[PDB]
Amino acid sequence: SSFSFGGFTFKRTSGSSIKREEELLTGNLQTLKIRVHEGYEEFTMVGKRATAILRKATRRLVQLIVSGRDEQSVAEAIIVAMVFSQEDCMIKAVRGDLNFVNRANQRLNPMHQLLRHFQKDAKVLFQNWGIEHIDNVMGMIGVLPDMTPSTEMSMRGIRVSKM
Ligand SMILES: CN1CN([C@@H]2O[C@H](COP(=O)(O)OP(=O)(O)OP(=O)(O)O)[C@@H](O)[C@H]2O)c2nc(N)[nH]c(=O)c21
């Protein structure tokens, strides 16, 4: 896999997956027909303003370690990764109906619907993601739902490091 999503390039460095189509419902009772990936995979994400290592399994973000130019740039990468992971809690974070369209009046695919939704506002996504205690070693630091750094706690699986 060498591809892109949410304006970041992803390069799979280990693992693999089967796509398996599932219909998932949002709190607004919308069906999203989503090609759910199955298996355990690691990627390097590279954007112009942030890079990250993403480890994930089936509908689960195991770890993301992000290096970004600044706080906005780190958030952007975290949102893309939270959507990419296909997590239940990201789907449950959706508020209202998703009807985004491309500059040619076609519906964005469902993964892009989710992404465009959270790029507009990520408060509910980050608030419902989950918090964990962290070891704070090797220069990894945590990031809280309001993007404040913490050496004690972080959004689950999310670390920030410039090393
Ligand atoms: C969640 N994803 C998404 N993804 C890939 O990310 C790329 C961008 O997704 P997209 O443009 O929404 O999908 P599209 O091109 O319509 O294909 P698809 O319908 O397979 O998502 C696709 O190549 C898709 O396979 C993935 N690739 C791997 N290896 N593992 C994964 O978990 C995922």
From Swiss-Prot:
Domain of life assignment: Viruses
Location in the cell: Virion; Host nucleus; Host mitochondrion
Family, as annotated: Belongs to the influenza viruses PB2 family.
Subunit structure of this chain's protein: Influenza RNA polymerase is composed of three subunits: PB1, PB2 and PA. Interacts (via N-terminus) with PB1 (via C-terminus). Interacts with nucleoprotein NP (via N-terminus). Interacts (via N-terminus) with host MAVS (via N-terminus); this interaction inhibits host innate immune response.
Function comment: Plays an essential role in transcription initiation and cap-stealing mechanism, in which cellular capped pre-mRNAs are used to generate primers for viral transcription. Recognizes and binds the 7-methylguanosine-containing cap of the target pre-RNA which is subsequently cleaved after 10-13 nucleotides by the viral protein PA. Plays a role in the initiation of the viral genome replication and modulates the activity of the ribonucleoprotein (RNP) complex.
Protein name in UniProt: Polymerase basic protein 2
Native species: Influenza A virus (strain A/Hong Kong/1/1968 H3N2)
Part of the full-length chain shown: 321 to 483 of 759
